[PDB]
């Protein structure tokens, strides 16, 4: 199952890289680092949690921007390698207005773009250098480049003419992307 993309018609003429760069700037950097972790401000959360789930989700400390990662995710906390998110990410959904997550699934009230069949997978022993950790931490720290790089590779695996510099409408014509 190759990467599949859903997008709001709004973004049809945007490139995937343009959308990711803009969304990351709107979201900002939650500053989840030693000495700066503020529960309920920059922790986000898991479903079901508390440290593991089929989803991890977080909203901006300032804007309405949010994302949801779907897969099977595990946070090591103090277990070596400490502060590592690992497991699998199948889907990343970007947009604004995070809802749910505590007895029900996290969802975006305004889902803008969703990338599924991502096939992201990393073991605990890879630590913070694992592709799951890099991709998801980048999205909450103001750097969408790890996710853009992974999407670029997945698109080129469908056809070398496709890239993150393709527009959503281009990927729609190629059968990879679909409106809504």
Numbering used by the authors: 1 to 180
Wording from the paper:
To explore the types of metal complexes that could be incorporated into HasA originated from bacteria having the heme acquisition system, we found that HasApf5, derived from Pseudomonas protegens PF-5, can form a more stable complex with Fe-TPP than HasAp. Size-exclusion chromatography (SEC) analysis of HasApf5 bound to Fe-TPP showed a single sharp peak under both alkaline and neutral conditions (pH 7.0–9.5), whereas Fe-TPP bound to HasAp gave a single sharp peak only under alkaline conditions. The UV-vis spectra of HasApf5 bound to Fe-TPP recorded after several days were almost identical to the initial spectra even under neutral conditions, suggesting that the Fe-TPP binding is highly stable. Furthermore, HasApf5 capture of Fe-TPP was stable even at high temperatures. The Tm value of HasApf5 capture of Fe-TPP was estimated to be 60.5 °C, which is relatively high and comparable to that of HasAp-bound Fe-TPP under alkaline conditions (62.4 °C). The crystal structure of HasApf5 with Fe-TPP was determined at 1.45 Å resolution. Its overall structure is similar to that of HasAp with Fe-TPP (root-mean-square deviation [RMSD] over amino acid residues 2–180 for Cα atoms: 0.397), and Fe-TPP is positioned in the heme-binding site with coordination by His32 and Tyr75. Upon closer examination and comparison, additional hydrogen bonds mediated by water molecules were observed at the Fe-TPP binding site: namely, Glu36-water-Arg33, Lys124-water-Ser79 and -Asn80. These additional hydrogen-bonding interactions appear to contribute to the stabilization of the Fe-TPP binding. The result of docking simulations of Fe- TPP-phen into HasApf5 using the crystal structure of the Fe-TPP-binding form indicated that the phen ligand is anchored away from the HasApf5 surface, suggesting that the formation of HasApf5 assemblies would be possible through the addition of metal ions.
